[PDB]
Structures are given as structure tokens and as C-alpha cells.
């Protein structure tokens, strides 16, 4: 069994760390929808540092379960049952990413979505088009300006949204990174 045994545990070693990964895909999605609620400021700055670990957790996930996952390709390059159980852990993995990465966009939106009513409570005359001017990068610095001529509240309200947006979109692009790393092939060596 010496021959076989280090394989499989290197099998099992990754499905668990998928099963890690998985569970902290779920603690993500859900701490952003409790985040979504809440209402009390010291609670929510305990749920984004809970946010902030699991996203951290997942990221060190990823970059091991990436270099386990291709490694166990290359145990199985001539070896047809090696290759199917890492192909099978590969497949697992894939999707997991693609569940992230659609919990980050759903959230992505959501915080788009309190961007554009914060401004029509502002402008409950806006149009669509103004409203979404008025969230753009260039959009907000104008009416910032505009207002250098009660601006304090919506502009940390506003700076606060626009850097968890911009954690998100750096998640995002590390997933698509990952994602398209792990469609590539695990080639023979000789
Ligand atoms: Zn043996
Ligand atoms: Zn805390």
C-alpha cells in the first residue's frame, strides 16, 4: 500500500481543505447579508472584521488548494485512477470559486444598488442617468466640490462604501485569476 497511500492522503487532505473552503464561502455570504441589516454601528464592526478574516481565510485556502490540486494532476499524468480523483477534486474546487465569486458579485450590487438611493434621498428628482453619474468616480468628486461652495456624513458614508467596493473588486479579479489558473492543463515533463 506504500505505493498508494501517499496519494490518497494527499486526496483527502485536499477535499478537506475544500470542505474548509467551502464552509468559509458560506460564513462570507453570510456575514454579508447580516451586514446588509445591521443597524447598530458597534456590531457591524465586529461583522466586518469577521467578514475581513474569512476573506483572508479563503485567500490562503485558494493559493494552497491551487498548488495541492496541481500537484495531485501531475501525481496522475500516466496514471488514469490518480488522474480521475484529482480531476474530481479540481472539479469541486472550480465550482466552489465560482460560488464565491458570485457571492462577491451579488454583494458588489447590493452596494451599488445603497449607493444610488443614498443620492436619490438627495436628489429624489434624479433621473437614471444622473443617478448614475452621481455614483461614478468622477460623478461623486463634482458634488463634493459642488458642495465645497451636512457633506461630512455623506462623504464618509460615501468613502466607506467605495473602499469595500474596491475590496471586492480585488477579490473578484483574485478569483478570475485563480479560476482561469485552474483551467489551465497540468502538463507531461520530460
Ligand atoms: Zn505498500
Ligand atoms: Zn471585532
Same mark, same amino acid.
Given at each position: 500500500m506504500h505505493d498508494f497511500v501517499g496519494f490518497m492522503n494527499k486526496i483527502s487532505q485536499i477535499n478537506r481543505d475544500l470542505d474548509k473552503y467551502d464552509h468559509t464561502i458560506n460564513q462570507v455570504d453570510s456575514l454579508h447579508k447580516r451586514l446588509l441589516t445591521e443597524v447598530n454601528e458597534e456590531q457591524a464592526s465586529h461583522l466586518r472584521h469577521s467578514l475581513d478574516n474569512f476573506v483572508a481565510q479563503a485567500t490562503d485556502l485558494q493559493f494552497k488548494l491551487k498548488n495541492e490540486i $496541481?500537484?495531485?494532476?501531475?501525481?496522475?499524468?500516466?496514471?488514469?485512477? $490518480?488522474?480521475?480523483?484529482? !480531476?474530481? &477534486?479540481? *472539479?469541486?474546487?472550480? $465550482?466552489? +470559486?465560482?460560488?464565491?465569486? +458570485?457571492?462577491? &458579485?451579488?454583494?458588489? !450590487?447590493?452596494?451599488?444598488? *445603497?449607493?444610488?438611493?443614498?443620492?436619490? +434621498? +438627495?436628489?429624489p428628482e434624479a433621473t437614471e442617468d444622473e443617478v448614475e453619474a452621481a455614483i461614478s468616480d468622477v460623478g461623486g468628486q463634482q458634488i463634493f466640490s459642488q458642495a465645497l461652495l451636512e457633506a461630512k456624513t455623506a462623504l464618509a458614508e460615501v468613502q466607506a462604501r467605495h473602499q469595500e467596493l474596491l475590496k471586492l473588486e480585488k477579490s473578484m479579479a483574485e478569483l478570475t485569476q485563480l479560476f482561469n489558473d485552474m483551467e489551465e492543463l497540468v502538463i507531461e515533463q520530460q
Open positions: $496541481k500537484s495531485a494532476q501531475r501525481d496522475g499524468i500516466h496514471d488514469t485512477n $490518480k488522474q480521475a480523483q484529482a !480531476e474530481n &477534486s479540481r *472539479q469541486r474546487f472550480l $465550482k466552489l +470559486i465560482q460560488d464565491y465569486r +458570485i457571492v462577491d &458579485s451579488n454583494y458588489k !450590487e447590493e452596494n451599488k444598488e *445603497q449607493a444610488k438611493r443614498q443620492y436619490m +434621498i +438627495i436628489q
